[PDB]
Structure formats: C-alpha cells, structure tokens
Design a protein around this ligand. Structure first.
Ligand SMILES: *[C@@H]1O[C@H](CO)[C@@H](O[C@@H]2O[C@H](CO)[C@@H](O[C@@H]3O[C@H](CO[C@H]4O[C@H](CO)[C@@H](O)[C@H](O)[C@@H]4O)[C@@H](O)[C@H](O[C@H]4O[C@H](CO)[C@@H](O)[C@H](O)[C@@H]4O)[C@@H]3O)[C@H](O)[C@H]2NC(C)=O)[C@H](O)[C@H]1NC(C)=O
Ligand code: A1AR1
Ligand SMILES: *[C@@H]1O[C@H](CO)[C@@H](O[C@@H]2O[C@H](CO)[C@@H](O[C@@H]3O[C@H](CO)[C@@H](O)[C@H](O)[C@@H]3O)[C@H](O)[C@H]2NC(C)=O)[C@H](O)[C@H]1NC(C)=O
Ligand SMILES: *[C@@H]1O[C@H](CO)[C@@H](O[C@@H]2O[C@H](CO)[C@@H](O)[C@H](O)[C@H]2NC(C)=O)[C@H](O)[C@H]1NC(C)=O
Ligand SMILES: *[C@@H]1O[C@H](CO)[C@@H](O[C@@H]2O[C@H](CO)[C@@H](O)[C@H](O)[C@H]2NC(C)=O)[C@H](O)[C@H]1NC(C)=O
Ligand SMILES: *[C@@H]1O[C@H](CO)[C@@H](O[C@@H]2O[C@H](CO)[C@@H](O)[C@H](O)[C@H]2NC(C)=O)[C@H](O)[C@H]1NC(C)=O
Ligand code: NAG
Ligand code: NAG
Length: 268
C-alpha cells in the first residue's frame, strides 16, 4: 500500500498483470539527455567539466507508468513499483496526446515523492491538468491504493489519491505551464541538505530550474500513480503511457555548449 487511508474497496484484485516485467530502456546522455542548465550562468561554444546530480550513462530506465481501466491490482502498490528515492531521480515522460472532436488533450502519470505517505509528513505531488503542471507539497492523507483519471476521455471510476475533507497544511503550492503539443517532458527531482530541488523541460532535452523547497526531513520513497481511462489501449486508439525513471547520483560530466548556449552533447 502507499498511504494507509481506506479510500475505497471498489474493483480491487491481486492479478499479476506484469507477466512481462517492468519495461527497460538504456540511458544515453550523448545528446544532452539527463543534463541541466547551470544556475544563472551562460557558456558559449565550449566544453565544461561539471559535477552535478546526473544519471549513470548505460544504466537502465524503468517504465513505471500503469494504465488501468476499472480494476486496480494490489501488486501495483508494492516493490518493484514503490521505489527508493536515495539522492533523486531523472524522469523521461511521454506526453500522451489524445483527441476528442478533433480537439487535443494532454495526459501523463502523476508522481508522488515522500517518506511514509501519512498526514503527519509532507508528500510532494506533481500532476498534469492538460497544459498546467500543478505541484504541491502537503500533509496529504494518501490512500492505500492511489490513482488518477483521464479527465479528457473519462474513466470507469472517480479520481482518488488522497482523502482530506478540509485543506491540509502545505509548504508549497504552485502551477507551471507546459506546451501541450511537445512529445516528451524531462524532469530532475533530487534532494540535498534537507532541501528538495526540481528541474524540468517541455522542449529540448537539457532541463531548467522550476523550484526548490526546504523540507528539513530526508525523502525516502517515490511512486508513479496508476491512471485509469476508457481510452489509451490497443482495442480503442493504440495510444500508450510511458514514464521512464532512473536514479540520480553526484557525477562529473563533460557538457558541450553550442554558439547559442544550448547544451548539445554530454559525456559521463
Ligand atoms: C490522518 O490520517 C489518518 C490515517 O493515517 C486518519 O485516521 C483514520 O480516520 C478515519 C475517519 O475518522 C477512521 O475511520 C474509521 O471508520 C470505521 C467505519 O468506516 C465505515 O463507516 C463510516 C461511517 O460510520 C464511513 O465513513 C466509512 O467510509 C466506512 O464505510 C470505524 O469502524 C472506525 O472505528 C475504529 O474505532 C472503534 C473504537 O472506537 C473500533 O471498534 C473500530 O473497529 C475501529 O478501530 C473508524 O472511525 C480510521 O480508523 C482512522 N485510522 C487510523 C489509523 O486512525 C485521520 O483521520 C487523518 N487526519 C485528518 C485530520 O484527516
Ligand atoms: C498495467 C497494465 O497491465 N495495464 C494494461 C491493462 C491491465 O493489464 C488490466 O486492466 C488489468 O486488469 C485487472 C487488474 O483486472 O490492460 C489493458 O488492456 C485490456 C486488455 O488486457 C483492455 O483491452 C480492456 O479489455 C477489457 O476486456 C477489460 O476489462 O480488461 C475491456 C476494457 O474496456 C479494455 N480497456 C480499454 C477499452 O481501454 C487495459 O487498458 O485495461 C492495457 C493496459 O496497458
Ligand atoms: C492551479 O491549477 C489547478 C488546475 O487547473 C487549479 O485548480 C482548479 O481551480 C478551479 C478554481 O478554483 C476549481 O474550479 C472550481 O471547482 C469547484 C468544485 O468542483 C466548483 O464548485 C467551482 O464552481 C469551480 O468550478 C477546480 O475544481 C480546480 N481543480 C481542477 C482539477 O481544475 C488551481 O486553482 C490553480 N491555482 C493554484 C494556486 O493552485
Ligand atoms: C474499507 O472501506 C470499505 C468501504 O469503502 C469497507 O467496505 C464495507 O465493509 C462493511 C463491513 O461491515 C460492509 O458492510 C459494506 O457492505 C462494505 N462496502 C461498503 C460500500 O461500505 C471495507 O470493509 C473497508 N476495509 C477494508 C479492509 O477494505
Ligand atoms: C566555435 O568554436 C570552434 C572551435 O574552436 C570555431 O571553429 C574554428 O573556426 C576557425 C575560423 O575562425 C577555423 O579556421 C577552424 O578550422 C574551426 N575549427 C573547427 C574544429 O571547426 C568556431 O569559429 C567558433 N564559432 C564561434 C561563433 O565562436
Ligand atoms: C510547442 O511545441 C511544438 C512542437 O514541438 C512547437 O512546434 C514547432 O515549432 C517550430 C518553430 O518554433 C517549428 O519549426 C516546428 O515545425 C513545429 N513543430 C510542429 C510539430 O508543429 C511549438 O513552437 C511550441 N510552442 C511553444 C510556445 O512552446
Ligand atoms: C463516483 O462519484 C459519484 C458521485 O459522488 C458516485 O455516485 C459514484 O457511485 C462514484 N463511483 C465510483 C466507482 O466511485
Ligand atoms: C492497433 O494497431 C494494430 C497493428 O497495426 C491493428 O491491428 C489494430 O487494428 C489497431 N487498432 C486501432 C484501434 O487502431
């Protein structure tokens, strides 16, 4: 289980849907994937050695996205999906572009980051709402079996990942825009000295700083929430979710900057 609040018992079962296991893909930073822009600095037409929170090159990404329809498997709310946060993670996220009456809509998995997922501790949550990325850090009463929905196409169940009837205490609450038309989003989430840090990019590969947040407590787990939808499958539209993650660590990279300050290449 993620939290411990019994939000519902509707359509829960124990089926091992991952008969083929967690899907994997290989980290390759040679085109600037996994890198981020350094503070407020600009470098031009040059190569820098820099030490930062980066992926290991030639490590695996894991796809932790989980599309459901009606039933939720209890096995989705355990290891290997519930994952140790350590120093941090890098995410490569497919923007699942759907259509209704030729209008475009953007969906992708919510991620939660925390320690015990109980309302006496802060949980960070990052959730898309069709071009608005809502980010919060609050004492959420997380469910046992949290999940989200396709607000665009609809779902066979209502949304529930927390159960707070009155607004919980929050250290942070902001919205950030993202371009609904791009195919990928990239994120770094990491912690140093009890402060959480977030970088993203919705265009290109090198990420840029969103925010930082003092927690005063070590984060220790993260989890990518299942998404339930009447769309997003081979019998209806051949679309897919993907939410690739890999661990960060303190590493030295060569970074190459072009003559307009974009990071074009890197070496581990
Ligand atoms: C912070 O997070 C914690 C969890 O970590 C929350 O604690 C839980 O709070 C709920 C709500 O108060 C407790 O709910 C339990 O409900 C049982 C009945 O549930 C059914 O019926 C009710 C209507 O009566 C429906 O609302 C519900 O949806 C279900 O259909 C009760 O039986 C439970 O009673 C317990 O105590 C009696 C003795 O007094 C025993 O006989 C019972 O067997 C049982 O042990 C209870 O009322 C839930 O139990 C709480 N869990 C824990 C671990 O404490 C906090 O509420 C939350 N804080 C804030 C501010 O939101
Ligand atoms: C994490 C994972 O494994 N995710 C897959 C999902 C689950 O394994 C399954 O949900 C588990 O179920 C449990 C735990 O009991 O199966 C999906 O594929 C289904 C067939 O496997 C799909 O075709 C559905 O077929 C139906 O016969 C039915 O109900 O399963 C009718 C329903 O309308 C239709 N869904 C639609 C229209 O999207 C799906 O989607 O649900 C593809 C997802 O990638
Ligand atoms: C950040 O972005 C989110 C997502 O867009 C904003 O949340 C949404 O805010 C609106 C306005 O408060 C909510 O609409 C209201 O909902 C109630 C309940 O259904 C209804 O009675 C009102 O008439 C009105 O429609 C909306 O529900 C809410 N959530 C979602 C998923 O859209 C949020 O306001 C933005 N700002 C901040 C600082 O978070
Ligand atoms: C979790 O909460 C659900 C309700 O959302 C509980 O299910 C009810 O259990 C009582 C036990 O007396 C039954 O009379 C009801 O018919 C059940 N359903 C509903 C809709 O209330 C469930 O027992 C709780 N606990 C667990 C471990 O699932
Ligand atoms: C960017 O740096 C490169 C590499 O130093 C520069 O390329 C050289 O440019 C000179 C002419 O100024 C040529 O004679 C060399 O043959 C080039 N070397 C290579 C490896 O291509 C480039 O001029 C710089 N551009 C800017 C705008 O700073
Ligand atoms: C939002 O994302 C789309 C897709 O990446 C961007 O569209 C591209 O824009 C450039 C010019 O800036 C064109 O050369 C490409 O041909 C466009 N691609 C497609 C598929 O249309 C769009 O510019 C982005 N807009 C913002 C405001 O970020
Ligand atoms: C969804 O919410 C509506 C309105 O509260 C309720 O009538 C319905 O039973 C709920 N369905 C599920 C599966 O939670
Ligand atoms: C999904 O793709 C397969 C392979 O091309 C095809 O057989 C199937 O009919 C497609 N279904 C839809 C809804 O596009």
């Amino acid at each position: 289980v993620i939290g411990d609040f019994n939000c519902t018992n509707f359509a829960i079962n124990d089926l091992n849907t991952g008969g083929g296991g967690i899907s994997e893909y290989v980290v390759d930073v040679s085109y600037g994937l996994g890198t981020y822009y350094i503070l407020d600095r600009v470098y031009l037409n040059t190569t820098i050695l820099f030490t930062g929170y980066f992926p290991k090159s030639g490590a695996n990404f894991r796809d932790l996205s989980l599309k459901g329809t009606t039933y939720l498997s209890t096995l989705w709310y355990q290891k290997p999906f519930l994952s140790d946060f350590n120093n941090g993670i890098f995410s490569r996220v497919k923007n699942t572009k759907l259509y209704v009456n030729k209008t475009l809509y953007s969906e992708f998995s919510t991620i939660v980051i925390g320690s015990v997922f109980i309302n006496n501790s802060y949980t960070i949550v990052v959730q898309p709402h069709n071009g608005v990325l809502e980010i919060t850090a609050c004492q959420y009463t997380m469910c046992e079996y949290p999940h989200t929905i396709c607000k665009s196409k609809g779902s066979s169940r209502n949304e529930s990942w927390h159960f707070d009837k009155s607004e919980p205490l929050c250290l942070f609450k902001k919205n950030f825009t993202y371009n609904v038309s791009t195919d990928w989003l990239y994120f770094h989430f990491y912690q140093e000295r009890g402060t959480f840090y977030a970088y993203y990019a919705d265009s290109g590969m090198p990420t840029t700083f969103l925010f930082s947040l003092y927690l005063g407590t070590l984060l220790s787990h993260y989890y990518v929430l299942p998404l339930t939808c009447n769309a997003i499958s081979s019998n209806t539209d051949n679309e897919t979710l993907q939410y690739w993650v890999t661990p960060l660590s303190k590493r030295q990279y060569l970074l190459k900057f072009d003559n307009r300050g974009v990071i074009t290449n890197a070496v581990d």
